């Protein structure tokens, strides 16, 4: 209150006579060339020694030291000069100028005085009466030196003695003008203290105070003296003082002087002296008075006039920072800051303190950015010519540095706060609040700059980081709020059903387990925000463009917070599977899109393989599962529809049936659903491919199986189209599987998906072999039948250099006759199969058939039932009427015809495979036996009949031979010394005298020229007869001993009658080749055992029925004991 009313009064006084009424003294230096007296002090001006100043405008003559002590303006001092030259009336005139100035001022600017009244809340009547007071303080006070004076006589020291006591009873009189007063008396003292005050009136600075000290005589002498002298109280001394030496308040001691005829004087008097030319010395330092004025005015303007709205001033330039108000108010504070000097920066800091209480009002952040840029520029640069620091010049602020620092920090914090929710506090929908926002960051740069420049702080908070925190803050508050309120937000902001805009359950404003829609909704929220940040805020907040892309900070913050939440969601869905596979696939495309839009290009995530595919992968696998099972049900349907269609070929040249196509179509539709994800994690891809390669393997083996199963039922000799088509299906699987494997990225494929499909292809191959076999096999009975007929037809042909012209019928006619049963079957079927089998299929079929055929002929014709089943039977010791040249031909031509048929010009089998067919080469080889030489055949017999020695069926006795294989010392041939030691167990109890002897024979090749037989002497009546007789066979030199065997035979001697065979044993000379010599018991058989090659050779040697070696061989091997004299039957 005190300061407010003091400042009200001083503002009224300051502006009733505004200092802008005043005029300046144009002084010339002027020589007082005669003794002259100064119009201020009345002091001597004289010569050059004491020159004066003569004004022209005020005219006024004074000391130099007085030309400024001439206090009043050049109007008033022109008046006072005019009174001191002669015209006093000019003084009353300029008193009337002072009146008229104040009347005009009031009448012309009444709004100044009214505003001071309203700002200081004074009434109009009381304002009129305080205005009477400040009018009077310049209008009674228009020209006054009407001093009240208040003289405290304090004390004296060293006074003269005069007393009745012998000391003195000093009192004092004081006089000013005619008026006279006294102290009471100090008694008996020469150093008295009174401290006694006298008020006086003076009307002239050239008056004197008179002060006089008196010894108080109250005695008969003083009662007498009172009749003759005025001063009845013996005078102790005086001082006399000019009123112009006085001012304000004083406390001074003065030495004392004489006056009266009674005077004896010494010492001094102390006087306190007040002089009430003194006025408002009670100044709050005019700073503070101006502040009070300014705060009152500011609240009055903003709050009272403008209802708290900050009216931005009637301001001019950047120096709006110095024009705080409209004219009236501006002139108020300026006439105050002029009359009372208050510096422009102090005025400004006061205004910035005011504004900070309102900083949120529109445009105020631009004004405060301005005002602070200036208060900064002031302390940082204005008078930075002073070597004092900005922070210290700012300390020397009469406002108080600290008060200002606090104020900035509070404000800055309040800005940081508002920025931390920039979106909510400065919505993009208000460009005005986007501009206040922009001007706020301009203010915050201006504060950071003040801290850096005026406070001289070295690392103040960097304006970009300060704001980046606030943005991150505002973004995280956004994210929390969206993740918790997704439905309310997506609801109101976009939702594709108006019934879904409201407070949907929290399990749907955060994550649902039932649906993916919260997440599609959250995706759109995220997009929208990043857009607003990119689009409204990144431009609004461009001050740190390099540091502060609001759109990027948005995309990063929001995705990060999202991706966490989404990952857990996908894991949660995976436990429950309430949404369909498909829904997660749709969500995957949305998420794939979203990342690949906003996120992938932020450096942080450009740096990485996207992790999101790991979220969807189980749902893709689920889909692959649903897919495989559907595909396997489909597979069975397709196979069964095709089966119902009897497995027709898709066309007569599209050799597989339609199910193959359907399946590959399905598998491709399926694969493409996978492929359409393009998962950027190739191991998750690898997993899908492993999963699917299994699907494929399973489906295709299940096909190949369902085929392989039905296959044999179709192999019957009339549905033949169908097994062809099924093998073509199988092969077509392999073929399209190679394609699909390539489509899955071929050799680039996951090694285990690849492992699977390689395994699969190998199994499908092995299936196709077994089908080709099973197929070729169903014709086998027909083949065997036909081949037996061809064998029957061939048996009419014989060795036709030895037969008539119906069987010496040409090699061709015989071959044709022979061939005919098969050529019928062949031509039809191979043509049909060549038309309707895929070449892979056909080749396998044909190999199987070829083998089968070859083997069938080799058996059924070349080692035929029409030969050996006679010779080794009770039937004919066959020739097959000689398998000469002719039936070697016929067959070789038929084989060739067949080989051309199976070859089918390369449409069938390769002439290489056929020529190098073991089936053929064996067949050819058996054909070669038939034409061979007798000794080669006999050699083949002894070498193959190795078993002729190990085991005899029912022995008739045994022979002890000691045999020596001398590689002969006389010739280098092989000779065989057979020492016939004895026989034993001879089953020969004959009716005549028994006379046993032992024959020994040799068997092997090249024995036509050599003694094949020896015999011992006889022994009478003896069934274990000894001989000790030595024979010497010769072998060939060229054939080794393993080409030979002894054939021992005991016999009964009957001269003039006939000798009789008692038994037979074979000793292989292959043993004696090793043993060198051998004592051995040879069990005598009744016959000698053979194998099929003994018998094939014996069938070919029996054809040599005229060759004496072949006769004697066929005879000596068909040689047997008569059962007489010794019991049971032989065995084969």
Swiss-Prot record:
Disruption phenotype: Mice display normal synapse formation but abnormal synaptic vesicle maturation and die shortly after birth. Heterozygotes exhibit impaired insulin secretion and abnormal glucose tolerance. Ca(2+) 1 binds at residues 163, 169, 215, 217. Residues 130-254, 955-1082 form the C2 domain. Signal peptide: none annotated. Its main location: cytoplasm. Residues 564-707 form the MHD1 domain. Keywords: Calcium, Cell membrane, Cell projection, Coiled coil, Cytoplasm, Differentiation, Exocytosis, Membrane, Metal-binding, Phosphoprotein, Repeat, Synapse, Zinc, Zinc-finger. GO terms for cellular component: axon; calyx of Held; cytoplasm; glutamatergic synapse; neuromuscular junction; neuron projection; presynapse; presynaptic active zone. One of its GO terms (biological process) is synaptic transmission, glutamatergic. A zinc finger (Phorbol-ester/DAG-type) spans 24-74. Residues 816-941 form the MHD2 domain. It is a peripheral membrane protein. It is found in: Cytoplasm; Cell membrane; Presynaptic cell membrane; Presynaptic active zone. Its cofactor is Ca(2+). Ca(2+) 2 binds at residues 163, 215, 217, 234. Plays a role in vesicle maturation during exocytosis as a target of the diacylglycerol second messenger pathway. Involved in neurotransmitter release by acting in synaptic vesicle priming prior to vesicle fusion and participates in the activity-dependent refilling of readily releasable vesicle pool (RRP). Essential for synaptic vesicle maturation in most excitatory/glutamatergic but not inhibitory/GABA-mediated synapses. Facilitates neuronal dense core vesicles fusion as well as controls the location and efficiency of their synaptic release. The C2 domains are not involved in calcium-dependent phospholipid binding. The C-terminal region containing both MHD domains and the third C2 domain is required for synaptic vesicle priming activity. This is Protein unc-13 homolog A. The lineage of its organism: Eukaryota, Metazoa, Chordata, Craniata, Vertebrata.
């Amino acid at each position: 209150e005190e300061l407010k009313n003091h400042v009200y009064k001083k503002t009224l006084q300051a502006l009733i006579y505004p200092i802008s009424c005043t005029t300046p003294h144009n002084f010339e230096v002027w020589t007082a060339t005669t003794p002259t007296y100064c119009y201020e002090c009345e002091g001597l001006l004289w010569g050059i020694a004491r020159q004066g100043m003569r004004c022209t405008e005020c005219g006024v003559k004074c000391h130099e030291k007085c030309q400024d002590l001439l206090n009043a303006d050049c109007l008033q001092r022109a008046a006072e000069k005019s009174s001191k030259h002669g015209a006093e009336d000019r003084t009353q005139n300029i008193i009337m100028v002072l009146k008229d100035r104040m009347k005009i001022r009031e009448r012309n600017k009444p709004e100044i005085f009214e505003l001071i009244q309203e700002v200081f809340a004074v009434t109009k009547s009381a304002h009129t009466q305080q205005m009477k007071a400040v009018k009077q303080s310049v209008l009674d006070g228009t020209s006054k030196w009407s001093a009240k004076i208040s003289i405290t006589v304090v004390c004296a020291q060293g006074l003269q003695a005069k007393d009745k006591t012998g000391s003195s009873d000093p009192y004092v009189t004081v006089q000013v003008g005619k008026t006279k007063k006294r102290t009471k008396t100090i008694y008996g003292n020469l150093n008295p203290v009174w401290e006694e005050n006298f008020h006086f009136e003076c009307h002239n600075s050239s008056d004197r105070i008179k002060v006089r000290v008196w010894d108080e005589d109250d005695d008969i002498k003083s009662r007498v003296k009172q009749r003759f002298k005025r001063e009845s109280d013996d005078f102790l001394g005086q001082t006399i003082i000019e009123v112009r030496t006085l001012s304000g308040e004083m406390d001074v001691w003065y030495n004392l002087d004489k006056r009266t005829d009674k005077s004896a004087v010494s010492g001094a008097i102390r006087l306190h002296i007040s002089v009430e030319i003194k006025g408002e010395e009670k100044v709050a330092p005019y700073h503070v008075q101006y502040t009070c004025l300014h705060e009152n005015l500011f609240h009055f303007v903003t709050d009272v006039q403008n209802n708290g709205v900050v009216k931005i001033p009637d301001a001019k330039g950047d120096d709006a920072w110095k024009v705080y108000y409209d004219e009236t108010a501006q002139e108020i504070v300026d006439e105050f800051a002029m009359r009372y000097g208050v510096e422009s920066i102090y005025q400004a800091m006061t205004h910035f303190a005011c504004l900070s209480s309102k900083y949120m009002c529109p445009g105020v952040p631009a004004v405060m950015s301005t005002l602070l840029a200036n208060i900064n520029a002031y302390y940082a640069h204005t008078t930075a010519s002073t070597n004092v620091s900005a922070s210290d010049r700012f300390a020397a602020s009469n406002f108080g540095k600290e008060r200002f620092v606090k104020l900035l920090d509070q404000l800055h914090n309040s800005l940081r706060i508002d920025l931390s929710m920039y979106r909510n506090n400065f919505p993009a929908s208000s460009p005005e609040r986007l501009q206040d926002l922009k001007s706020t960051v301009d203010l915050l740069t201006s504060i950071t700059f003040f801290r850096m420049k005026v406070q001289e702080l070295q690392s103040p908070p960097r304006a970009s980081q300060v704001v980046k925190d606030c943005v991150k803050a505002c973004l995280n508050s956004t994210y929390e709020y969206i993740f918790n309120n997704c439905h309310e937000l997506y609801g109101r902001e976009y939702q594709t059903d108006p019934a879904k805009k409201g407070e949907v359950p929290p399990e749907e404003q955060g994550p649902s387990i039932k649906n993916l829609d919260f997440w599609s909704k959250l995706i759109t929220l995220i997009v929208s925000i990043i857009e607003e940040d990119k689009n409204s805020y990144t431009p609004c907040l461009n001050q740190f463009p390099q540091e502060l892309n609001v759109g990027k900070i948005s995309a990063e913050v929001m995705w990060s917070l999202f991706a966490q939440d989404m990952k857990y969601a996908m894991e949660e869905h995976d436990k429950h599977r309430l949404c369909k596979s498909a829904d997660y696939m749709n969500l995957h495309f949305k998420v794939k899109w979203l990342y690949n839009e906003y996120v992938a290009e932020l450096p942080t995530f450009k740096d990485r393989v996207p992790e999101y595919p790991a979220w969807f992968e189980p749902f893709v696998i689920q889909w692959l599962d649903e897919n495989e099972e559907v595909s396997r049900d489909f597979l069975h349907g397709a196979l069964e529809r095709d089966k119902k269609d009897g497995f027709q070929q898709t066309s007569e040249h599209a050799l597989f049936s339609c199910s193959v196509v359907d399946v590959f179509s399905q598998l491709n539709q399926s694969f493409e659903i996978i492929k359409k994800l393009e998962c950027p994690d190739p191991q998750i891809v690898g997993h899908y491919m492993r999963r699917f390669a299994k699907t494929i393997s399973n489906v295709l083996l299940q096909y190949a199986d369902i085929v392989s199963k039905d296959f044999a039922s179709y192999c019957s000799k009339e549905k033949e189209k169908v097994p062809c088509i099924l093998m073509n299906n199988t092969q077509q699987l392999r073929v399209q599987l190679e394609k699909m494997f390539e489509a899955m990225g071929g050799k680039e494929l996951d090694a285990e998906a690849s492992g699977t499909l390689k395994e699969l292809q190998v199994k499908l191959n092995n299936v196709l072999d077994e089908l080709s076999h099973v197929f070729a096999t169903s014709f086998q009975p027909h083949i065997e039948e036909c081949v037996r007929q061809m064998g029957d037809i061939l048996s009419q042909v014989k060795g036709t250099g030895n037969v008539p012209a119906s069987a010496c019928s040409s090699v061709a006619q015989d071959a044709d006759n022979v061939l005919q049963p098969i050529m019928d079957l062949l031509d039809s079927n191979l043509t049909l199969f060549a038309k309707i089998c895929e070449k892979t299929v056909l080749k396998r079929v044909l190999k199987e058939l070829w083998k089968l055929v070859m083997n069938t002929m080799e058996r059924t014709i070349v080692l035929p039932p029409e030969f050996l089943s006679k010779l080794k039977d009770h039937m004919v010791r066959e020739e097959a009427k000689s398998l000469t040249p002719k039936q070697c031909a016929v067959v070789e031509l038929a084989l060739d015809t067949i080989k051309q048929y199976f070859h089918a010009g390369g449409v069938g089998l390769k002439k290489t495979f056929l020529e190098k067919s073991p089936d053929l080469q064996s067949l050819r080889y058996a054909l070669s036996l038939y034409t061979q030489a007798t000794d080669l055949l006999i050699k083949t017999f002894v070498q193959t009949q190795s078993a002729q020695g190990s085991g005899v069926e029912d022995p008739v006795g045994e022979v002890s031979v000691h045999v020596e294989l001398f590689t002969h010392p006389g010739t280098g041939e092989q000779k065989v010394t057979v020492k016939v030691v004895a026989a034993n167990d001879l089953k020969w109890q004959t009716s005549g005298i028994f006379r046993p002897f032992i024959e020994v024979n040799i068997v092997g090749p090249q024995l036509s020229d050599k003694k094949r037989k020896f015999a011992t002497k006889s022994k009478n009546n003896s069934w274990a007869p000894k001989y000790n007789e030595s024979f010497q066979f010769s072998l060939s030199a060229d054939a080794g001993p393993e080409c030979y065997e002894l054939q021992v035979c005991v016999k009964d001697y009957c001269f003039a009658r006939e000798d009789r065979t008692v038994g037979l044993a074979v000793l292989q000379l292959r043993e004696l080749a090793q043993r060198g010599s051998a004592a051995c018991w040879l069990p005598l058989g009744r016959r000698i055992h053979m194998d099929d090659t003994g018998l094939t050779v014996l069938r070919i040697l029996s054809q040599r029925s005229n060759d004496e070696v072949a006769k004697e061989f066929v005879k000596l091997k068909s040689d047997t004991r008569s059962a007489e004299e010794g019991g049971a039957a032989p065995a084969p």
